[PDB]
Design a protein around this motif. Structure first.
Motif, PDB file in Angstrom:
ATOM      1  N   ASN A 130      47.976   3.360  22.092  1.00 38.08           N
ATOM      2  CA  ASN A 130      47.850   1.977  22.525  1.00 38.08           C
ATOM      3  C   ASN A 130      48.554   1.495  23.852  1.00 38.08           C
ATOM      4  OD1 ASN A 130      50.158  -0.209  22.092  1.00 38.08           O
ATOM      5  ND2 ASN A 130      50.312   1.525  20.529  1.00 38.08           N
ATOM      6  N   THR A 131      48.289   0.470  24.509  1.00 34.00           N
ATOM      7  CA  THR A 131      49.245  -0.124  25.721  1.00 34.00           C
ATOM      8  C   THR A 131      49.573  -1.319  25.323  1.00 34.00           C
ATOM      9  OG1 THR A 131      47.190  -0.764  26.788  1.00 34.00           O
ATOM     10  CG2 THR A 131      48.034   1.402  27.410  1.00 34.00           C
ATOM     11  N   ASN A 132      49.298  -1.761  24.011  1.00 33.28           N
ATOM     12  CA  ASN A 132      49.890  -3.257  23.668  1.00 33.28           C
ATOM     13  C   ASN A 132      51.084  -3.290  23.737  1.00 33.28           C
ATOM     14  OD1 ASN A 132      47.205  -4.522  23.177  1.00 33.28           O
ATOM     15  ND2 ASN A 132      47.073  -2.990  21.585  1.00 33.28           N
ATOM     16  N   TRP A 133      51.993  -2.203  23.353  1.00 39.23           N
ATOM     17  CA  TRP A 133      53.565  -2.175  23.056  1.00 39.23           C
ATOM     18  C   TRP A 133      54.054  -2.665  24.681  1.00 39.23           C
ATOM     19  CZ3 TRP A 133      56.625   0.766  26.515  1.00 39.23           C
ATOM     20  CH2 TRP A 133      56.112   1.766  27.224  1.00 39.23           C
ATOM     21  N   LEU A 134      53.167  -2.037  25.720  1.00 35.63           N
ATOM     22  CA  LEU A 134      53.596  -2.181  27.183  1.00 35.63           C
ATOM     23  C   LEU A 134      53.272  -3.382  27.901  1.00 35.63           C
ATOM     24  CD1 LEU A 134      54.913  -0.592  29.714  1.00 35.63           C
ATOM     25  CD2 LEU A 134      52.410   0.261  30.265  1.00 35.63           C
ATOM     26  N   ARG A 135      52.266  -4.137  27.268  1.00 39.39           N
ATOM     27  CA  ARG A 135      51.912  -5.387  27.543  1.00 39.39           C
ATOM     28  C   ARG A 135      53.054  -6.413  27.185  1.00 39.39           C
ATOM     29  NH1 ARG A 135      47.063  -6.900  30.892  1.00 39.39           N
ATOM     30  NH2 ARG A 135      45.922  -4.969  30.379  1.00 39.39           N
ATOM     31  N   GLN A 136      53.627  -6.024  26.189  1.00 40.56           N
ATOM     32  CA  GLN A 136      54.687  -6.914  25.405  1.00 40.56           C
ATOM     33  C   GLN A 136      56.237  -6.870  26.078  1.00 40.56           C
ATOM     34  OE1 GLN A 136      55.146  -6.210  21.143  1.00 40.56           O
ATOM     35  NE2 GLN A 136      57.286  -6.610  21.332  1.00 40.56           N
ATOM     36  N   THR A 137      56.444  -5.212  26.302  1.00 38.92           N
ATOM     37  CA  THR A 137      57.664  -5.168  27.335  1.00 38.92           C
ATOM     38  C   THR A 137      57.742  -5.658  28.712  1.00 38.92           C
ATOM     39  OG1 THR A 137      57.011  -2.873  26.816  1.00 38.92           O
ATOM     40  CG2 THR A 137      59.066  -3.296  25.790  1.00 38.92           C
TER      41      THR A 137
END
Ligand SMILES: [Ca+2]
Length: 844
Positions: free
Chosen positions: A109-116
């Motif tokens: 997923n890229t949601n973690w990257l959205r958040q960082t």
């Protein structure tokens, strides 16, 4: 050398997350290739977006801050100081990109990257509230004013945004006729997204919505019986006053309120207009609605409710009002009004603020409380209500209500939270004053009529006031009236000092009026050691009868009157009624249908005075647990009580589904004043008070008892609009004046400024204008005062956007969130004829 791989897949706007074709610090984009799993450069597809800040930075210092931050997030051990080379930073960023892509693959997923990335963004001054300073005394610390003419954001241009056009300053210059408030009589920016009510298209849309509210039953449920009858105008001193002519014109054209009092009183609408100039302005405008009596409110507050050592003399209760009640013998008072001592906000949320500031969070900002702060504050507040010595809550609530409920020449408004606890489930818990208030409300139907006299007498070591109604049919003390004059009328006696003591030779001689010679009276309410005793019938008071003399005077002595100090009374309250009214005696009068002839719509005569308004909610009600606790379900079940109390106008809470952003009290306790969709009355989901169907039923239940129901019309603002928009913005104070020393002046800013286009606004917005112009063409022929032009119904608002707003509260997004080329100081742009992108991303 990642620059080739990371270059943009193409310059088409579709390749970027833009807002109105600008890029932001949080924009992602599609590169040519992705370093799949950190190992293999692979042609991107359409799903392969990545943050711009993974491959590009606005300057070398931001790249350093990004590397140091992402290294810490990703367990890379090296940090870089300011002497670091461009080479080291580029290598480090490429190492970071490597780790990012291993982690996208490993975690699917890229949601973690959205958040960082978003969290990194907020660490930069240019991208957080630091660059929005200095702050100012707007409730949410500052506003942004949208520029009327900007080539960068031409879709948000306007010819209007005429600010601070309050009733006092409607023409842009303080009105010379009204001098009791020396300011400009309000200010444009209050909370959230500020609606431009000087825009003629927005004005027609406020009229559309007014019409919707007043035909709510017809429109939503096809039931001519579930319509709101009247409106409250919220935050008058914060919007363009043209709306007052628009709403008055609508009441007149659609409801005939200017024809006769029967029509006016079936649609009796109020303003929330705090300036002292607003009453005489509203009177000159035609008394198409009524305003509060703020002077009288203040007199009750300072003469009765304040802490003993802050308390003023009592004479202001008589003279400091729109009506001097020393001798009020008029068939019609000079100006109509409503009167109250507390309301859902006034002297409720202020006291919660006092508690939090003193005992819980000394830096609390405005009324931006958390739910946790509110709950803790209520512990302290609920104890304080029960104590004899009160630190934070009102004294003498019963004395204030005895005056409110017997005064001539004003419609009283009873605040829900004075009868039931301010917190807790609707109507679930009665205050210690409930019984005294209910006894006054029931005695008011039966006894309160005729002319009024108030006296202030200095006695013993203090003073009292006496307040007399002469009874139905006697406007003057010399009028003899008939049988019903004899058994109606009332006397209220009050003192505001607990050490009050009369000498043995002191008398309070009270002229009851000439209908009342040689007559038995009995107590309605008496103050006692511990509280106030209520008598619900002549019989219940049988041992306590007293009489008037030959002259129609009741005479009181030391035996009757002295000062007490208990949870309800700090001073003295006695109220007496004539013996022998029949059980169903009712001295109220219905409005006449005879034509009005003085050019005013609403008239403060005996019919208007027969009315009682109930403000039927508290901001701090608990959230329902189950269907049966919903406010609107409970109002329908208890409609008989409101009728027994003689409530004639039920002021419901605004019914719009609340936003949940939490950026101000209204959207923490979800009262209905903070909303995203004006037409969503419990439709998409329940409001705090129930579903749209529960609202329909409460309105029908109130109508089945002849009670009118008021819609709270809230044109000033909207919250939490779902879609982003770029505007050209300037930091201003709450009047629209540019803030000294700010960094944001005609600079691009991304606001939350457009509604979805798919909500209740999209269905109803502008939907009635065609019908309104056919039936009531005179509404559309006024040239409005602030603009000099008519409403403009030729455009429907189905989707709100920044062009219809003056501005917004500051959002903490920063001065530099819309990205710029530092070298040329030019904004990047994706408009197809005029594309301008970072050079390292198009031409590495
Ligand atoms: Ca405003």
């Amino acid at each position: 050398s990642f620059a080739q791989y990371n270059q943009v897949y193409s310059t088409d706007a579709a390749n970027f997350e833009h807002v109105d074709h600008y890029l932001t610090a949080e924009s992602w984009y599609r590169p040519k290739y992705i370093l799949k799993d950190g190992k293999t450069w692979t042609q991107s597809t359409e799903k392969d977006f990545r943050p711009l800040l993974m491959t590009w930075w606005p300057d070398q210092e931001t790249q350093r801050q990004y590397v140091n931050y992402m290294n810490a997030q990703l367990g890379i051990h090296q940090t870089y100081n300011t002497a670091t080379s461009p080479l080291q930073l580029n290598l480090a960023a490429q190492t970071i990109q490597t780790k990012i892509e291993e982690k996208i693959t490993a975690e699917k997923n890229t949601n973690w990257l959205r958040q960082t990335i978003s969290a990194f963004v907020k660490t930069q001054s240019a991208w957080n509230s630091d660059s929005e300073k200095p702050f100012d005394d707007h409730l949410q610390k500052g506003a942004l004013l949208y520029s009327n003419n900007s080539k960068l954001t031409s879709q948000a241009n306007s010819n209007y945004r005429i600010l601070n056009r309050t009733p006092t300053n409607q023409t842009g210059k303080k009105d010379p006729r009204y001098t009791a408030d020396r300011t400009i009589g309000g200010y444009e920016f209050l909370l959230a997204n500020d609606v431009d009510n000087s825009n003629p298209v927005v004005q027609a849309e406020q009229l559309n919505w007014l019409h919707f509210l007043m035909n709510f039953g017809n429109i939503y449920a096809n039931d001519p019986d579930a319509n709101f009858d009247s409106i409250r105008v919220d935050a008058v001193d914060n919007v363009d006053a043209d709306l007052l002519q628009i709403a008055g014109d609508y009441l007149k054209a659609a409801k005939g309120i200017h024809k006769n009092d029967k029509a006016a009183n079936d649609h009796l609408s109020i303003l929330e207009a705090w300036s002292y100039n607003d009453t005489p302005y509203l009177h000159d405008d035609g008394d198409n609605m009524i305003n509060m009596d703020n002077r009288l409110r203040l007199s009750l507050l300072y003469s009765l409710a304040k802490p003993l050592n802050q308390r003023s003399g009592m004479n202001p209760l008589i003279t400091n009002s729109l009506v001097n009640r020393t001798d009020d013998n008029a068939e019609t008072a000079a100006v109509p009004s409503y009167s109250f001592i507390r309301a859902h906000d006034s002297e409720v949320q202020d006291l919660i603020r006092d508690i939090i500031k003193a005992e819980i969070n000394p830096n609390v900002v405005g009324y931006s409380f958390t739910m946790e702060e509110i709950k803790k504050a209520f512990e302290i507040y609920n104890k304080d209500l029960l104590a004899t010595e009160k630190k934070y809550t009102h004294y003498n609530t019963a004395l204030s209500y005895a005056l409110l409920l017997t005064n001539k020449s004003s419609v009283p408004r009873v605040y829900y939270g004075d009868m039931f606890t301010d917190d807790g489930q609707y109507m679930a818990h009665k205050t210690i004053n409930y019984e005294a208030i209910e006894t006054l409300l029931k005695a008011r139907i039966k006894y309160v009529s005729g002319g009024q006299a108030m006296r202030n007498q200095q006695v013993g070591n203090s003073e009292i006031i006496t307040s007399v109604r002469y009874g139905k049919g006697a406007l003057k003390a010399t009028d003899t009236g008939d049988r019903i004059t004899r058994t109606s009328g009332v006397v209220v006696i009050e003192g505001n000092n607990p050490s009050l003591r009369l000498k043995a030779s002191d008398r309070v001689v009270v002229n009851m009026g000439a209908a009342h010679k040689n007559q038995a009276y009995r107590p309605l309410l008496l103050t006692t050691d511990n509280g106030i005793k209520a008598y619900h019938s002549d019989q219940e008071a049988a041992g306590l009868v007293r009489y008037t003399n030959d002259r129609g005077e009741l005479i009181f002595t030391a035996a009757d009157i002295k000062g007490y100090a208990n949870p309800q009374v700090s001073g003295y309250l006695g109220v007496w009624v004539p013996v022998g009214a029949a059980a169903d005696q009712d001295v109220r009068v219905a409005a006449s249908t005879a034509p009005s002839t003085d050019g005013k719509s609403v008239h403060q005569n005996a019919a208007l005075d027969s009315r009682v308004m109930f403000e039927g909610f508290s901001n701090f009600q608990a959230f329902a647990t189950k269907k049966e606790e919903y406010t609107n379900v409970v109002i329908a079940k208890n409609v008989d009580k409101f009728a027994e109390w003689g409530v004639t106008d039920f002021e419901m809470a605004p019914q719009y589904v609340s936003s949940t952003d939490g950026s101000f009290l209204d959207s923490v306790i979800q009262n209905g004043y903070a909303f995203t969709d004006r037409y969503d009355l419990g439709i998409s989901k329940p409001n705090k008070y129930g579903t749209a169907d529960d609202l329909v039923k409460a309105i029908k239940a109130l109508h089945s008892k002849g009670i009118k129901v008021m819609a709270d019309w809230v044109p000033d603002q909207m919250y939490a609009l779902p879609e982003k928009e770029v505007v050209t913005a300037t930091r201003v104070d709450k009047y629209g004046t540019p803030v000294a020393g700010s960094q944001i002046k005609n600079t691009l800013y991304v606001v939350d400024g457009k509604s979805s286009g798919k909500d209740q606004q999209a269905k109803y917005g502008g939907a009635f204008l065609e019908e309104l112009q056919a039936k009531y063409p005179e509404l559309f022929a006024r040239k409005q005062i602030s603009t000099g032009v008519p409403m403009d119904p030729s455009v429907k608002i189905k989707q709100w956007s920044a062009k219809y707003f003056n501005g917004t509260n500051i959002l903490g997004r920063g001065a530099g969130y819309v990205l710029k080329d530092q070298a040329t100081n030019t904004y990047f742009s994706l408009v197809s004829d005029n594309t301008f992108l970072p050079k390292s991303l198009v031409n590495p």
